[PDB]
Design a binder for this molecule. Structure first.
Ligand SMILES: [K+]
Ligand SMILES: [K+]
Ligand SMILES: [K+]
Ligand SMILES: [K+]
Ligand SMILES: [K+]
Ligand SMILES: [Mg+2]
Ligand SMILES: [Mg+2]
Ligand SMILES: [Mg+2]
Ligand SMILES: [Mg+2]
Ligand SMILES: [Mg+2]
Ligand SMILES: [Mg+2]
Ligand SMILES: [Mg+2]
Lengths: 163, 49, 48, 48, 49, 177
RNA sequence: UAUUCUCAAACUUUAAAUAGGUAGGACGGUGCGGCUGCUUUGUUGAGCCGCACCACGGAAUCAAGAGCUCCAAGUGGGCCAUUUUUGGUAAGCAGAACUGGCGAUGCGGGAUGAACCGGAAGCCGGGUUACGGUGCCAAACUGCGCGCUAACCUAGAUCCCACAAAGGGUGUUGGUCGAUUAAGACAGCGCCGAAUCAACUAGCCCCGAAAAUGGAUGGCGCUUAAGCGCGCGACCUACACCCGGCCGUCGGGGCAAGUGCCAGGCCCCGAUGAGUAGGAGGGCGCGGCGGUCGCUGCAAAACCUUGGGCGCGAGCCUGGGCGGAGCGGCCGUCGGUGCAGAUCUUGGU
């Protein structure tokens, strides 16, 4: 409405991948969705029912409801000077389980194990990971050195493959 | 001022000679030049031949 | 102790460089772990 | 280091004693901006 | 007499004066809009808990 | 003794990886007012000619090169490529100086004066000490004279320092060669 | 059939940079038990609820702190700039995207200018810079150096910027590729004797280059430049940076068996200062009323004065004169309460 249809400017967004049209693989319908799961919204152009608005395409949200064929997703949306947690319902064909938190549980388990080991030996440690820092000094074995010099200019080589 | 200063040698003679040889080799490679043989079209201009 | 440590680090760096040259190889200095940053432009017309 | 550095109020340095070369250009081009590596020390001498 | 038609100039600055505000998320969120059957069963389970 | 331009030998290589445990080591002879700018230009050339960036590269060594005998005159040849307002060109020039640093400074000054080429538009391809008999430019060959003799045609008149400078003088200067 | 030149805002397999979304624990994890009318062939699941244990705070940096609510002003003509960009031959045209700026903002530089460069500001002393400059105007070198240019067209002289093109030059200065030459290169008479010929390239200069008041590198002038390109030292120069003094604002702290205080006070410690429309606080001033404290014929009000002083200021206190009958301070409270403008009103000049 108001000068723009629901699917305006979706020629590329809602189109299917090259040589990937037709029947949908069964893995899409065999997935399990539960409350609190993070999902990625990817519109399947062949499924016209339960289609999210184009804005939510390419955005990640959290599952808050589970119906027979669709799943409720809460997606942040910036409107002027605030963020709105807009709740939508989307069919499972248009949604994929997100990997944005795949390493969290593993890291927590390893941190707990390390903390328990440190407590056993009576030491205090920090399990926080750190950004890559400066490397220490080291010795590099001498080898044959190849000299690099600027190339004399030749106009005939200005074209790819030569003039 | 007294000019009675000692003659101190931190490094012995053989290792001093080794250090001098290594430094000379390093300087030689430092001042070394390329053969400039990769530019066949400019061999005459560059003075290679 | 801190002054002695500073002198020892300087001497160790010099000795490491000399030994690397003697062996014919290269010694890569440890990368700087500390920086000092001085603002040189004013506060007018700033990008966010 | 974090606690000690945060404890230090940002240093309020005076204008350089000998001036600057050109603050609109990188130090590599002959300006003043960017990483000037070990040469920051002389600038600090002139700024402290 | 024609005038300007539209522009977003200065709007992001206005939004950032006090924004961008993120509402605080509480531990328990509202159940409005959820599957009515599941909510009915949950209410009965709580009642008999 | 202060030179505006210094000669450095910069040594670097690509960061070792699983595929390349010992990557090729590259060396360059570069001219810059400082070692920092020399390293910057070294990385520029390595990126442009060998596909090795500073981000994925390693700096190994950098040493200054000093003239062996700054007390004697030598003939220096410089092969360079520069950019004009309309394209790129190759250029060979000759200079006489006690050090190659002075010759390079002369080269930069002369390029600026004669061709309006700024420093960042000049790439030095080669440098060498040329014997007197192998010099190609008449400008350098004119001073290859066992008995060189000429008068000081142009001499500027000034006091030893500004301490003796005066606005007014009783007599006009007396000049002769 | 196998090749091939050249293409797309409304073509495309492929496909960046920049930008967009999510997550990185105390609202976590583990093990038992329980509830259901939902779900399953199945206490099979799905949520939720109790108990027990663990949980070094789970990337960096910063955090002049975070959240919530009420009432309301003004505004709803914009404009300019780098980059992206549409219509248009183009426009100091017209219209969009991000950001910044002017509007609302002074200050140093660009001679001059809303937008360019620098930089934002309480009142001062000292020091140092930013942009820009150092022949005079005009603070700082006719400073130390290298080349180029000679303009008989007004040579040329600094982002925006106050324009110049295609073509040319045997002017001069460097480079590139070729040809001839001491078995002697080119021109003039086989003599003569050491350099010669040709094409490209690009710096400065010149032609190309015509408008009306006399005139604009800002002007004068400048050619061992005071022009052009590049350097080196030392200097000059902001209300910008640093130290100090003082004013205001904001934040913090100390002061009672009170020798104890306009506690609405005093003292101490840090940071900080632009403002149109607009909001608010604290104060100044005028005329009444309820109270209170006073002044005045030994001279009130009002008015006059190169007399003097206090306050950042609105204003206030006071000397002297004139005038000849009233007036003021303080606490509350009230109002027909503050003028430079309105082709404002009346009067006067
Ligand atoms: K309104
Ligand atoms: K020419
Ligand atoms: K009274
Ligand atoms: K008075
Ligand atoms: K009153
Ligand atoms: Mg400060
Ligand atoms: Mg800029
Ligand atoms: Mg975009
Ligand atoms: Mg600016
Ligand atoms: Mg001052
Ligand atoms: Mg001027
Ligand atoms: Mg009245």
């Amino acid at each position: 409405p108001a000068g723009h249809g629901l699917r305006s400017r979706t020629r590329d967004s809602f189109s299917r991948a090259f040589r990937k049209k037709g029947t949908i693989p069964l893995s899409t319908y065999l997935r399990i969705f539960k409350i609190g799961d993070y999902v990625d919204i990817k519109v399947n152009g062949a499924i016209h029912k339960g289609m999210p608005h184009k804005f939510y395409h390419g955005r990640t949200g959290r599952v808050w409801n589970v119906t027979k064929r669709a799943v409720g997703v809460e997606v942040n949306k910036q409107v002027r000077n605030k963020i709105l947690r807009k709740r939508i319902h989307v069919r499972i064909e248009h949604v994929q389980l997100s990997r944005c938190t795949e390493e969290v549980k593993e890291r927590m388990k390893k941190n707990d194990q390390l903390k328990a080991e440190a407590k056993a030996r009576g030491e205090v440690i920090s399990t926080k990971r750190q950004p890559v820092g400066p490397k220490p000094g080291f010795m590099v074995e001498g080898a044959t050195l190849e000299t690099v010099t600027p190339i004399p200019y030749d106009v005939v080589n200005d074209l790819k493959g030569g003039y | 001022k007294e000019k009675l200063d000692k003659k101190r040698h931190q490094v012995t003679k053989e290792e001093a000679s080794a250090i001098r040889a290594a430094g000379t080799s390093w300087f030689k490679t430092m001042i070394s030049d390329s053969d400039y043989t990769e530019f066949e079209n400019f061999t005459k201009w560059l003075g290679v031949t | 102790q801190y002054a002695k440590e500073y002198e020892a680090q300087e001497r160790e760096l010099i000795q490491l460089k000399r030994e690397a040259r003697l062996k014919g190889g290269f010694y890569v200095d440890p990368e700087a772990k500390l920086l000092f940053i001085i603002r040189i432009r004013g506060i007018n017309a700033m990008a966010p | 280091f974090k606690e000690a550095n945060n404890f230090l109020w940002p240093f309020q340095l005076k204008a350089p004693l000998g001036g600057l070369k050109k603050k609109r250009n990188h130090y590599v081009e002959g300006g003043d901006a960017g990483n000037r590596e070990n040469y920051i020390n002389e600038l600090i001498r002139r700024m402290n | 007499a024609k005038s300007k038609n539209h522009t977003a100039h200065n709007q992001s600055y206005k939004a950032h004066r006090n924004g961008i505000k993120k509402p605080r998320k509480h531990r328990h969120s509202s159940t409005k809009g959820m599957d009515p059957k599941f909510l009915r069963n949950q209410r009965y389970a709580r009642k008999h808990n | 003794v202060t030179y505006k331009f210094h000669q450095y030998q910069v040594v670097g290589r690509a960061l070792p990886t699983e595929n390349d445990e010992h990557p090729k080591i590259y060396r360059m002879k570069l001219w810059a007012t400082n070692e920092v700018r020399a390293k910057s230009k070294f990385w520029y050339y390595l990126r442009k000619l060998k596909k090795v960036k500073k981000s994925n590269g390693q700096m190994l060594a950098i040493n200054e090169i000093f003239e062996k005998n700054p007390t004697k005159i030598k003939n220096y040849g410089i092969w360079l490529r520069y950019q004009s307002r309309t394209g790129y060109h190759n250029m060979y020039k000759e200079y006489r100086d006690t050090t190659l640093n002075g010759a390079v400074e002369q080269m930069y000054t002369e390029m600026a004066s004669r061709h309006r080429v700024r420093h960042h538009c000049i790439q030095i391809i080669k440098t060498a000490t040329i014997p007197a008999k192998l010099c190609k430019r008449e400008s350098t060959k004119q001073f290859h004279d066992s008995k060189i003799k000429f008068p000081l045609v142009f001499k500027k008149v000034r006091p030893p320092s500004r301490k003796l400078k005066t606005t007014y003088k009783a007599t006009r200067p007396n000049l002769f060669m």
